[model samples]
Target: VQIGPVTDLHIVNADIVPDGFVRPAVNAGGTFPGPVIAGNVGDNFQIVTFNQLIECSMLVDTSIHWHGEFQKGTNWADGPAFITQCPIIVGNSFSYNFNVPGMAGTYWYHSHLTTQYCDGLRGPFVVYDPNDPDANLYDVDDDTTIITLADWYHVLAKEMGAGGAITADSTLIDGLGRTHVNVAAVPLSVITVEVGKRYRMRLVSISCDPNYDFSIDGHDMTIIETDGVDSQELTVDEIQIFAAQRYSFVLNANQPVGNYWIRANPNSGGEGFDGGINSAILRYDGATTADPVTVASTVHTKCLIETDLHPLSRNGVPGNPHQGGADCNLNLSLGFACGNFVINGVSFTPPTVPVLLQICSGANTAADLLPSGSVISLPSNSTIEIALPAGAAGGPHPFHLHGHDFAVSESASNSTSNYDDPIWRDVVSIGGVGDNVTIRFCTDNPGPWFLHCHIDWHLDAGFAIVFAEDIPNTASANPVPEAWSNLCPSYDSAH
Candidate 1:
């Protein structure tokens, strides 16, 4: 089911059996994978989120983040716990009144509190462009075409807190899959398509950990958008999607009418579709109700290479055309020590007061921040470059930044940097050992934005930092409502 630009979204606790194992889940809109909250470009999204979660197993306190939508002036609605706003206490309602002025594409929303979204509470949020430049590329673009890949766990996230082998029990595609252990006869998710038509498949990964190698049995997808940025079409047979990433691909259904296997092989889950473990159905209109007997190719000839993607418009690159050409250049050293991920020798711990609240109350400089070294200040309206050199303990980390999308100056596993015309996105994987992943963006939004690994466990174990962008203008830029101001105090008193 799909919902709208303005809606009353709820967070609650319920029982779900996504992988044939019944588990308590925290859900949005009363569904395992919540409803698609959609809107057009430059629309005001007034999502009044009600936190009615009473179950402790799933961790009740909630905050929803519009994953890739840059909350430009509305920083309070950016929704990272203790970075922008506090978690909404149980039985309370908070209205996220924000506007999408200049951005539109595939985005998502999930619980921003510690490891809470893994239990459930994740959904797709698409901002449509009425005047989309690539509107004529496809025929169908709607809820049925939205594909989501998730890693479901039998063990509650609260019980499995921070330590020892965080692997998924099953891989869920569109909220349906079989467990690796049991392999029950659960009904798989079916995506229906008509022959001789092109469909826009908005693929999103709302995963806590583990990237997936996604492909269809007999179809090639032409990529059009990456993490909400419009990209020149690049056709590929398979795409490796990291956590919190999105891709909009055009799938041409020109083959014979039949059922084909939609495969999403995760890095750490059940390897193949033994009993429909990591599989979904791509059914043509007149196909029979039978499983696809197709097999995957030994090697994908046309795999998605990040360096191959460029912005549809070549002039969209932010800074000067070179490495270290930005106004403020920063080299961040990522490290891991004693079961905790560290950035520049500092392990992040959420402060007693949110960084935004502190700034609103006259904590103007990074030095004035409470959690020492947890906050990095940036000059206003300057192009900033951040070099993330990976070799950390848990590698190939998909790093995400809130409140802005950045150009991938250098992608993972690639030594050559592309400052002229690389694809812009909100998240990029910092590749393996001895790889330097660099990204550049202009500091126009004034607030405390989060830069962290998309892996929820790593984030819970202190792999995060706040970019206090334009701290001097933060208060004047984002004016908080009374409900937002009450969040920290109420949460503090309750806990």
Candidate 2:
């Protein structure tokens, strides 16, 4: 049965019947896909989370991260563990309330702590423009489809760790060894459409492991938005989506319609390509009459290039002041250490350094005392550029930034040159080793923002960091959260 509103949900350990698969039941349920919380543009959206799971050995804390919302001056609600607040233990709860600037698009939510998200803790957050002038604006009548891409690992939870590492003793699928599975195109969900009608497909890659190259067997898809913001429509031969990223597209079924398979093929250059191919079918209404034809692999003509579409300053927050100034720059090495993916040579741990020092000093913190590192603090209100070196180790990491979407200024590899496709994006694919990409964004949203690898496991490993800045006095007069004053104490040095 449906539970609470998309915003306020109580997630608890409940039981669900899995389709086609039957086994010993366990505790599950809570906010799954979480709930499809909806709000109008420029409205205050509050998500109150109540974690009701029974106590176990592992600390069962819960927090919510608004995947692509610009919440200036609301860093406390951003939901990274210890960075904003302590974990919400069993029977306890927390409220994440923030204003939604009038930017309408597709977005999502997921757990910020632990791998419980892998067990099913996510959902869609769709905001729409009520007064959109477009004749084909998505209304209640428009066929709405939500496609979530995920990497399903059937192995016991113990086999997987915070970083993208796996240790399995038995093989679940033949020919595929103990590797993660990208279930983006898997036949778990289906979309049925009618002829000569417009359909809005909101696609999110909730996969904790792999980046996906998604394409339909026979359909020309027009991308209308990215990261929950509107953009010009661009057609693509295949859309590349990284973990924790979302894309919205409109498909006009004109002719030559039939049951087409939406396939997500692994880039092969990245990690998590194990089991067989992943696929889902899209059935059209008049399939019997429409011509059934398959389009061969063709280079997409309207390929959308990545571009920066940073948010405008509002409520004492700095506008895009630094349109093109990058003060601090650094290269992050992605690889595997101790069988887990390491970011900047570290794994994710609660802060031991003084909160003020970690935020202001721009210190290069070590993970497990390793020197693998990350460069922090590009001057706020200035343009910040990050480069992902080509042929880096590990898998294709989907890099995402909170509060603002950035432009992919440059990208180069042996196979393709995507530098020319400059669509504004909040997330970009950092191709595997030897693949290089540069991204730039304006620090328009003030307060502690998060910049990290979108792969759920990668962020959990330490490929994640918080970016904080003071909001301009003219932006908003609201007082900052009192809880953030002494949030990150150097617990390690003192205790």
Candidate 3:
């Protein structure tokens, strides 16, 4: 399923048996993993989202965020419930009209209301660059080469709230897989490739929680893009992709025509391919439709590490390369306490009024903001450095920032920081205890942008904060539509 540029997206309640277990889900465009909404760079994407969810176990209220699109002037459509706008009330339709200016590469959209995206409201979104510098890299770069890795749940997301440790029931590669418990032989997803051709495969992790070690048997991938940023090609055998991350790798089908296993081993789930779990088939054209018997290597020698990637173009590092080199330097203490994740001693809870609504309606400073101490305001046109020291109860948390892509000054894997040419992305994993994952970005977009753990469970457990940049200019810069202005009012009246 594929839709885009300008289209109507309906959110509906449905049942999906991705892993042979019939469970209720919230679907976008009538599919488990929604259609690939695509357009060229600088094109205006007018997505009118109609919430038609009637009787779903997963909550019905919906709002769609165009993840990683950097909604500069149109922040109202930069959806995060109560951060940008309230969730479009059930049975109502709202238009997410925005442009992808000066941006190209892989992106996605999902329900930003809660853990609803885990129930299946996500899909691929690509902004193509017709004049892309790496245009001559491959033969195919369309929806056919898009690969999505997802974590499916037998139980509804809301039911598995802040309990003990939470894990997925199955791994869904392109919306089909075998369940961990039943191990029933369902029809596995097959990625087709033609021999002697180079394909640019865009891999996206639409996971709520779980980082996957993804690789294809007997093949090495040359990485070209990371989270929508073009990076210098780096060839590797395996990649550890965390939640809400993406990569565009060039795959050369130079091997003899046969079936190969495409494996994604998650951090916490069914471990191996005992009964075809966490597995998909990569079939070359004119090959047999039988299952592959190829096995993985004992150790992947050329595994991808974050420190090894650099921007393809010398977009000089945003700020001074060293720590605290930015104009606004802040150190965030991440931890878990009382069953909720906290940053700098404040657990986030969405305010009654959307943060933008507050700023637009005369909220002057952070003190005037709702949910006190959770909003960090940034000045205009200044480089901001956020030092996120990871020692939280959750060992490794993939942190994502909305409305901007940033340079990873200090990556989680290595103790040494890279100021020269580090890979820029929207998401970065804050590794185990004592590791500081630092990021720097220029706060040019004026609005309330979200900064939080990409894990839905952790986010549901109050792990988030808002970067209210340039409060004085936010109201003037990002204007709201009538539909957006009515969201909070309608939601409040109904509640």
Off by over 4 Å in 2: 1-6, 15-19, 22-32, 55-59, 133-143, 156-158, 161-188, 256-258, 266-277, 286-325, 331-347, 352-375, 412-421, 470-495
Give candidates' CA RMSD values in order: 1.0, 7.0, 0.9
TM-score of each: 0.99, 0.75, 0.99
**Residue by residue across 270-333, what tens digits does model 3's lDDT show?**
9999889999999999999899999998999999999999999897677786788889999998
Residue range 111-217, candidate 2, lDDT tens digits: 66655565556666777667543327442222147676655444434335533454222111111122233322222345677777766777877666666677776
lDDT of 1 by residue, 472-495 (tens): 899999998899998988999999
Query: What lDDT would each prediction earn against the true structure?
Result: 0.91, 0.54, 0.91
Could you tell me the C-alpha RMSD of candidate 3 in Å? 0.9
Which residue ranges in model 3 land beyond 4 Å of their true spot?
Answer: none
Worst 10 residues of 2 by lDDT: 168-177
